[PDB]
Amino acid sequence: HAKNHDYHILPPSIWPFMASVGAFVMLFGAVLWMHGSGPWMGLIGLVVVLYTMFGWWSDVVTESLEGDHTPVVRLGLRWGFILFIMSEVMFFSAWFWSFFKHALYPMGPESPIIDGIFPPEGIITFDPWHLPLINTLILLCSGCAATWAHHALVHENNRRDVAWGLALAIALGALFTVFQAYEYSHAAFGFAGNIYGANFFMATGFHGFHVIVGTIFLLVCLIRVQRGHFTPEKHVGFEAAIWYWHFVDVVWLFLFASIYIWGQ
Amino acid sequence: VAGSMDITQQEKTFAGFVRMVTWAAVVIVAALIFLALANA
Amino acid sequence: RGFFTRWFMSTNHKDIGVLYLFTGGLVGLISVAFTVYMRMELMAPGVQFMCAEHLESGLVKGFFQSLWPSAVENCTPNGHLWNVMITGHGILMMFFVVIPALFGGFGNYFMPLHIGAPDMAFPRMNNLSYWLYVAGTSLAVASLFAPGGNGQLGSGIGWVLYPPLSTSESGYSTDLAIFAVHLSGASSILGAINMITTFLNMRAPGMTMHKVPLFAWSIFVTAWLILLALPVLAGAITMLLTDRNFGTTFFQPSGGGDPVLYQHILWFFGHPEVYIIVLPAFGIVSHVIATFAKKPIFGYLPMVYAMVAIGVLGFVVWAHHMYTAGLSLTQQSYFMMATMVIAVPTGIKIFSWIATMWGGSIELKTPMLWALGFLFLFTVGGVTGIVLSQASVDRYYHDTYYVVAHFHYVMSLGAVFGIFAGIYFWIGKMSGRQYPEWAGKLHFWMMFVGANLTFFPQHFLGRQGMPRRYIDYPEAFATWNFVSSLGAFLSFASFLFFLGVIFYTLTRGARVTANNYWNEHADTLEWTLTSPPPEHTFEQLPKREDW
Amino acid sequence: LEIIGRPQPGGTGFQPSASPVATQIHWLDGFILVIIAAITIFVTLLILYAVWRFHEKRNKVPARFTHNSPLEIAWTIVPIVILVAIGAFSLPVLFNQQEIPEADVTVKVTGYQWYWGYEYPDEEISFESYMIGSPATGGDNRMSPEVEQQLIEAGYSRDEFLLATDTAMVVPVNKTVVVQVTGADVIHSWTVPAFGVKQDAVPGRLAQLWFRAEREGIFFGQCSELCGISHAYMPITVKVVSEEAYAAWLEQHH
Ligand code: HEA
Ligand code: HEA
Ligand SMILES: CCCCCCCCCCCCCCCCCC(=O)OC[C@H](COP(=O)(O)OCCN)OC(=O)CCCCCCCCCCCCCCCCC
Ligand SMILES: CCCCCCCCCCCCCCCCCC(=O)OC[C@H](COP(=O)(O)OCCN)OC(=O)CCCCCCCCCCCCCCCCC
Ligand SMILES: CCCCCCCCCCCCO[C@H]1O[C@H](CO)[C@@H](O[C@H]2O[C@H](CO)[C@@H](O)[C@H](O)[C@H]2O)[C@H](O)[C@H]1O
Ligand SMILES: [Ca+2]
Ligand SMILES: [Cu+]
Ligand SMILES: [Cu+]
Ligand SMILES: [Cu+]
Ligand SMILES: [Mg+2]
């Protein structure tokens, strides 16, 4: 009743409360799963959360189709995602720190005085050109496929290449994690009991979790192109997809030139 | 009158925020490249 | 419009902020109760309350037995409980009490008002930050009643979860605490993202950032620290989680780990963390001193840029928590000097507040007392920091109650005074009922007397060599430990009295007439709105002439 | 036999010096303590006076000023000088206590959950220092009739309960002991307040301190990093004796 501002005001919503009940149970049940009892309490949580996330984000489309995403709101949603991406970079930095330390000054039997050998004695690394470069061409190509999709909708309004490009990107994205899940099978070293395995499998591990996320995210954007949901002016969800995906590429390119090239 | 609102102050602030964060990010990458070229 | 839809589904920031305030009080009281029991044992040497014998009774039983002493002959010292209490105290306070009441509680309420915003940028995600915070607090409480170390309940690691002790302490209680901290970060990061966007995108027309109220700036800087620090802590504790439960060797040396690398990564979060606590108090104190000294806050910009300066430098001084851990002399040198740089802008702000009082007409009402009290404690606390900054002297002082005294003066009492200053200042403006000025001024004075006789005696114990996390000490300390445990007991009564004062105020309280109930110089946008402000504030955006 | 490194029942200053580094830590703290004692007194009086001189009763109308470009630079240059002052005397004391010299004695100290371990690599000696109230020395990590008699045994009082250990690291006066420290279980920390040395025992790191013992007597120190249930109950005793007496011990312990 009687307002002059464009800012999005929201009706009350269960999902904040419902997600945090599920998330508490997810993480409590995971603790118990990690200590011998049944995964069931954990996966109840995962389902309640994944159900809540779904509900949540379905309304952020409903509202955008409802004409709530005004100029400012859309702009604000762009910062929100960038600030998020920045804190994603800060998360990964803790793992590049952990790697670069145990690479520059690896632990030797006379540790702070005289450092040890890197890569650890008897750790056979991956050939940085055989397979990892296949995955670096898988991702760099998928990053082009998703950018042609952006440039299509934004600067051509060409809905065919938007859909086509995204399908190719989602394909190569899921292909990366498939090809990477082979590099894990064919790993010349263990996960437990050595730092190299600890630094390697956790750093590429989280990146792979971020690729899985970025591919699911791109698929939600394609599913929406199937329903013809974006316009050249209004496409914040599609915008953040290509940002997030390009962020994943930067992370891999670092990993490649850190763990594989420089750290072989 | 939704859609009408004047954004000039905010769109300016966003260009600064982008210009700022990009600048800040290279300084830090440079600072670590210095620190590595100094005391690695 | 029902108790559930209003508080379990709110998207109105004013309510979510109120939720934060009240939960912060609740978890506070829990954690303050931990400290009254802690000083109870430390009252005089020998263990009397934390006896292994009490374990043979059940949970409820052995509890109420522990609340009442014993003879040194009938008491086997259970150090584990002691460690879980000190850990319980710290973790609750640093992750679930003080930041939530300042950043979550006041920050969510007033920062949108100060900048003339109708809501927050992402007010549905806002609610998620609160309920994730409750989820963390649950997991945190669960950690106290869980398969823990040395065959008992609870994790007795210390609020910073140092390894290999953390990684190898038995049970799963620690893993809960890990995930509790995970969610407390997830809360904060979302809250921060909201605050940053809100501040940058939703200001009033004509309000440039150099026209933004100081509290809003203080919250804005706090949000940036949170945005960048907490994700680093996530990695830190995830590495503890995989060492504990997936047998990696991030910090296990037999596999090639370095327990020192944890401290780097943790304290890379750990200092920003301590500036995330006090920075909102800087703002609140700025607003209060300017109001009740009837004088525009001395040196606006500088003040801000000081906050920016502190905020930037806060990341690159982290290793002065590690002077003893075995750091290269080159390193120890750098962190000694950088730590000294921070001291300058953190000092300067103390002067600006005095300069605001200089010249003005000072109404010594309750909020002004608390802000004045803060000034004292923040100096007393800050100067002992200069001592510790010099690595040479740190060797003697490190891991002694001298540090405990330092960080209580500057951080605990600093932020607590910040919180109370906020509460009395804004209670009418949030409830519609004012507090009784006699009770407030009493609560302040009890706290100020008690809390000084609590932690200043601890300075001595540190110089006398009493180390941290000791359930028992040589008899040759007990003089000061009794002085402290007295003050701490008195302090507990003050916080109890306060809980009454607000109970009186929220029910039997003097309903507030006007929009502004303080004086003309409480001149920011919240005092333009109704005393309990409308459920939808700034439907009509305020025109430039409104500030 | 003169118990020196020790708390006094309600003391406020440091523990007695016993080394050149512990003299300089006593000195630096005093120098700083003047400067901090000034700054708090100066801030307290500025606060008190302003509250009196500028109370709404004692002064009716507030002032209008907000900035003072001269005085504000005064507010900055002074603490930078104050810190350059303290810094100039503190960086020397830091290098001195961290640059290790030639060792007269070398000792390796190892942190074990709730006891210590000393090695003299040269003189071929090894032993473990448990607290006199230990469960390895019968006690429940508490005082009891039995536990007091044992304190007398080693030449200690009921006073020294939580400080006195069943075996001591013994050292020659005016000889530079280089103490190397590592942890075995979790992180422990070796300190002797009288000697002015603290070094964390981190598993998997060879960390080093040094102290030149100037006086003779018994010195104490307790563990300074939370290490588990009995973190209070693993202290340090360093008996320092004359070179003649120490040469007699170095054959005995063999
Ligand atoms: C509220 C947060 C806060 C603030 C503001 C501070 C203000 C400072 N504090 Fe610290 N402190 C912590 C939260 C804070 N700190 C916490 C939580 C811990 C412990 C965690 C744990 O160990 O468990 C800690 C422990 C700590 C240590 C390590 C002790 C140890 O464990 O060995 C050191 C040493 O470098 C230190 C230095 C400082 C310095 C140099 C300043 C200075 O920047 C202060 C500025 C000076 C003042 C505020 C006094 C007023 C001065 C003026 C008005 C003019 C300025 C004068 C000069 C520059 C000479 N702090
Ligand atoms: C900033 C948060 C905070 C707060 C508020 C405090 C309030 C107090 N703490 Fe501090 N404490 C720490 C952060 C705090 N503490 C940390 C992080 C550690 C490290 C754990 C470790 O060593 O590993 C520590 C360790 C510590 C120890 C020693 C443990 C050991 O070394 O073995 C002791 C005992 O002397 C201590 C005494 C007190 C007392 C008596 C109070 C108070 O009870 C006294 C007076 C103050 C009040 C009564 C204010 C209470 C009010 C609030 C908290 C506001 C609540 C919210 C609202 C009203 C909205 N604390
Ligand atoms: C845009 C997306 C990009 C992808 C995201 C990844 C970005 C992160 C990349 C940089 C990561 C930092 C890596 C730093 C590792 C340095 C190695 C190290 O740990 O130093 C070791 C030192 C202690 O070693 P010590 O044992 O004492 O040495 C004894 C001598 N033998 O310990 C030290 O002294 C610490 C050295 C200082 C290191 C500080 C690290 C801070 C981490 C913040 C990085 C954030 C990057 C932000 C960039 C902007 C991005 C937009
Ligand atoms: C995508 C395509 C890829 C293409 C690649 C091209 C991009 C290149 C990027 C390279 C960056 C890699 C980062 C590696 C940095 C290594 C850091 C380092 O070497 O410093 C460690 C050093 C070691 O310590 P020390 O024991 O004293 O050494 C003695 C032995 N000589 O530590 C010291 O010197 C001790 C002094 C400590 C100083 C700490 C300084 C603070 C850290 C910097 C600030 C960062 C914090 C972020 C700030 C955010 C807030 C604004
Ligand atoms: C949800 C969040 C996701 C982020 C976390 C990422 C988790 C990534 C998990 C990686 C799983 C590691 O799996 C790992 O198991 C085995 C034992 O350690 C390894 O080792 C195996 O091959 C090696 C052959 O030389 C041998 O050393 C081992 O005897 C053999 O068991 C595998 O080669 C490796 O792939
Ligand atoms: Ca006791
Ligand atoms: Cu710090
Ligand atoms: Cu120990
Ligand atoms: Cu210990
Ligand atoms: Mg320590």
A49 with A74, same domain: the answer is no
Q: What is the resolution of this structure in A?
A: 3.5
The helix or strand, by DSSP H or E, that contains position B16, with its residue range, turns out to be helix B8-39
Q: Select from C295, C363, C372 the Cβ nearest to the Cβ of D63.
A: C295
Calculated CA dihedral for residues C437, C443, C446, C450, nearest 10 degrees:
-150
Residue B30 has which token pair? Answer: 């440079």
Amino acid at C149: G
Q: Is C164 in the pocket of ligand 1 (CB under 6 A)?
A: no
Cα atoms in the 13 Å half-sphere on the side-chain side of D88: 6
Nearest to D177 by CA among D201, D199, D209: D209
Report the SS3 class of residue C191: helix
Q: Say if D94 falls within a structural domain.
A: yes
Nearest to A10 by CA among C113, C121, B3, C112: C121
Reply yes or no: is the peptide bond before residue D70 cis, omega within 30 of 0. Answer: no
Which sign, positive or negative, has the C-alpha torsion C513, C518, C520, C522?
Answer: negative
CA–CA separation, A252 and A211 (whole Å): 10
C390 sits in the region (left: phi over 0; alpha: psi -120 to 50; else beta) called beta
Cβ contacts of C64 within 8 Å, gap of 6 or more: none
Q: Whose CA is nearest to atom 38 of ligand 1?
A: C385
In chain D, which ranges are continuous DSSP H helix? 20-53, 69-98, 145-153, 243-252
Give CA separation, A103 vs A107, B30, C36, in Å.
9, 20, 47
- The domain total for chain D is 2
Distance C396 CA to ligand 6 centre (A): 24
CA–CA separation, C498 and D216 (whole Å): 55
D110 with D94, same domain: the answer is no
Report the SS3 class of residue C521: coil
Q: Whose CA is nearest to atom 20 of ligand 5?
A: A190
Nearest to C546 by CA among C512, C514, C515, C511: C515
DSSP C269-312: HHHHHHHHHHHHHHHHHHHHHHHHTTS--S-HHHHHHHHHHHHH
Q: Select from D28, D60, D191 the Cβ nearest to the Cβ of C390.
A: D28
Domain of residue D75 covers 6-101
Q: Do A3 and C6 touch (CB under 8 A)?
A: no
CA–CA separation, C467 and C71 (whole Å): 24
D118 with D231, same domain: the answer is yes
C275 is a catalytic site residue: yes
Q: Which of C298, C393, C468 to mutate to test the interface with D (most CBs of D within 10 A)?
A: C393
CA–CA separation, D9 and D27 (whole Å): 23
- The chain C residue lying nearest B10, using CA atoms, is C201
CA–CA separation, C272 and C274 (whole Å): 5
* List of chain C residues whose C-beta atoms are within 8 Å of the C-beta of residue A107: 253, 256-258
Q: Is C407 in the pocket of ligand 1 (CB under 6 A)?
A: yes
D245 with D134, same domain: the answer is yes
CA–CA separation, C376 and C441 (whole Å): 17
D60 with D116, same domain: the answer is no
| D67 marked among binding-site residues | no
Strands D169-172 and D197-201: unpaired
Q: Say if D1 falls within a structural domain.
A: no
D122 with D23, same domain: the answer is no
- The domain total for chain A is 2
* Burial class of residue C361 in the structure, from the number of CB atoms within 10 Å of its CB (0-12 exposed, 13-18 middle, 19+ buried): buried
D154 with D167, same domain: the answer is yes
Residue D29 has which token pair? Answer: 């703290």
Binding pocket residue ranges, ligand 2, CB within 6 Å: C 21, 24-25, 28, 32, 35, 38-39, 86, 89-90, 93-94, 97-98, 101, 158-159, 404, 408, 411-412, 415-416, 419, 451, 454, 468-469, 488, 491, 495
Q: Is C101 in the pocket of ligand 1 (CB under 6 A)?
A: no
CA–CA separation, C464 and C484 (whole Å): 15
Secondary structure in 3-state letters for C371-431 = HHHHHHHHHHHHHHHHHHHCHHHHHHHCCEHHHHHHHHHHHHHHHHHHHHHHHHHHHHHHH
Choose one of A12, A47, A68: the last residue of a domain.
A68
* List of chain C residues whose C-beta atoms are within 8 Å of the C-beta of residue D151: none
CA–CA separation, C45 and D69 (whole Å): 55
Q: What is the DSSP letter of C514?
A: S
D246 with D225, same domain: the answer is yes
- The chain D residue lying nearest A112, using CA atoms, is D205
CA–CA separation, C273 and D193 (whole Å): 30
Q: Say if D182 falls within a structural domain.
A: yes
Q: Whose CA is nearest to atom 5 of ligand 3?
A: A89
Beta bridge partners of D201: D188
C321 is a catalytic site residue: yes
Give CA separation, A57 vs A12, B38, C124, C185, C340, in Å.
15, 48, 11, 22, 47
CA–CA separation, C479 and C486 (whole Å): 11
Reply yes or no: is the peptide bond before residue A119 cis, omega within 30 of 0. Answer: yes
D124 with D55, same domain: the answer is no
Nearest to A24 by CA among C142, C135, C145: C135
Starting at the edge strand found earlier in the chain, the sheet holding D217-221 runs D169-172, D236-241, D217-221
A62 with A188, same domain: the answer is no
CA–CA separation, C338 and C15 (whole Å): 41
CATH number of the domain enclosing A60: 1.10.287.70
CA–CA separation, C460 and C463 (whole Å): 5
Report the SS3 class of residue C41: helix
DSSP C316-371: TTGGGG-HHHH--HHHHHHHHHHHHHHHHHHHHHHHHHHHHHTTS-B---HHHHHH
Residue D253 has which token pair? Answer: 């312990």
D186 with D83, same domain: the answer is no
CA–CA separation, D18 and D40 (whole Å): 31
CATH number of the domain enclosing D34: 1.10.287.90
D119 with D190, same domain: the answer is yes
CA–CA separation, A185 and A194 (whole Å): 17
Amino acid at D43: V
Choose one of A36, A68, A100: the last residue of a domain.
A68
C14 is a catalytic site residue: no
Q: Whose CA is nearest to atom 30 of ligand 1?
A: C398
Amino acid at A135: N
The helix or strand, by DSSP H or E, that contains position C491, with its residue range, turns out to be helix C478-508
Cα atoms in the 13 Å half-sphere on the side-chain side of D194: 23
Longest dimension (CA), chain D: 84
Choose one of D73, D101, D129: the last residue of a domain.
D101
CA–CA separation, A173 and A171 (whole Å): 5
Q: What is the DSSP letter of D67?
A: -
Residue pair C495/C469 in contact by the 8 Å Cβ criterion: no
D221 sits in the region (left: phi over 0; alpha: psi -120 to 50; else beta) called left
In C148-258, which ranges are continuous DSSP H helix? 165-168, 173-201, 214-245
A29 with A92, same domain: the answer is no
In C50-122, which ranges are continuous DSSP H helix? 59-66, 79-96, 98-99, 108-114
* Burial class of residue D97 in the structure, from the number of CB atoms within 10 Å of its CB (0-12 exposed, 13-18 middle, 19+ buried): buried
* Burial class of residue C29 in the structure, from the number of CB atoms within 10 Å of its CB (0-12 exposed, 13-18 middle, 19+ buried): middle
* List of chain B residues whose C-beta atoms are within 8 Å of the C-beta of residue A72: 5, 7, 10
A53 with A181, same domain: the answer is no
Choose one of A24, A41, A68: the last residue of a domain.
A68
Catalytic residue among C82, C109, C133, C159: C159
A175 with A54, same domain: the answer is no
Choose one of D101, D121, D154: the last residue of a domain.
D101
Q: Whose CA is nearest to atom 58 of ligand 2?
A: C25
CA–CA separation, C393 and C381 (whole Å): 16
Residue pair D223/C467 in contact by the 8 Å Cβ criterion: yes
DSSP chain A: ------PPP----SHHHHHHHHHHHHHHHHHHHTTTS-THHHHHHHHHHHHHHHHHHHHHHHHHHTT---HHHHHHHHHHHHHHHHHHHHHHHHHHHHHHHHHHS---SBTTTB---SS-TT-----TTTSHHHHHHHHHHHHHHHHHHHHHHHHT--HHHHHHHHHHHHHHHHHHHHHHHHHHHT-SS-SSS-HHHHHHHHHHHHHHHHHHHHHHHHHHHHHHHHTT---SS--HHHHHHHHHHHHHHHHHHHHIIIIIIIT-
Topology at the third CATH level for domain B1-40 = 1.20.5
A173 with A217, same domain: the answer is yes
Q: What residues have a C-beta under 5 A from ligand 7, the ion?
A: C 271
Residue pair C395/D197 in contact by the 8 Å Cβ criterion: yes
Choose one of D47, D81, D101: the last residue of a domain.
D101
Q: Is A187 in the pocket of ligand 5 (CB under 6 A)?
A: yes
Cα atoms in the 13 Å half-sphere on the side-chain side of C147: 7
Neighbours of A69 (CB within 10 A): 22
Q: Select from C9, C227, C230 the Cβ nearest to the Cβ of A83.
A: C227
Residue D126 has which token pair? Answer: 């090894």
Cβ contacts of C33 within 8 Å, gap of 6 or more: none
Q: What is the CA radius of gyration of chain A?
A: 22
D176 with D94, same domain: the answer is no
Nearest to C366 by CA among C432, C428, C321, C319: C428
Nearest to D222 by CA among B35, B14, C474: C474
Burial C414-431 (b: 16+ CB within 10 A, else e): bbbbbbbbbbbbbbbbbb
Nearest to C212 by CA among C323, C332, C116: C116
In C202-251, which ranges are continuous DSSP H helix? 214-245
Residue pair C506/C427 in contact by the 8 Å Cβ criterion: no
Q: Is B4 in the pocket of ligand 4 (CB under 6 A)?
A: no
What is the distance, to the nearest Å, from the Cα of residue C177 to the centroid of all Cα atoms in its chain?
18
Domains of chain C: 1-547 (1.20.210.10)
Nearest to D92 by CA among D23, D37, D34: D23
Q: Do A192 and C122 touch (CB under 8 A)?
A: no
The helix or strand, by DSSP H or E, that contains position C313, with its residue range, turns out to be helix C300-313
Closest-lying ligand 2 atom to the alpha carbon of residue C38: 34
Burial C442-476 (b: 16+ CB within 10 A, else e): bbbebbbebbbbbbbbbbbbbbbbbbbbbbbbbbb
Calculated CA dihedral for residues C516, C519, C523, C527, nearest 10 degrees:
-10
Domain of residue A62 covers 1-68
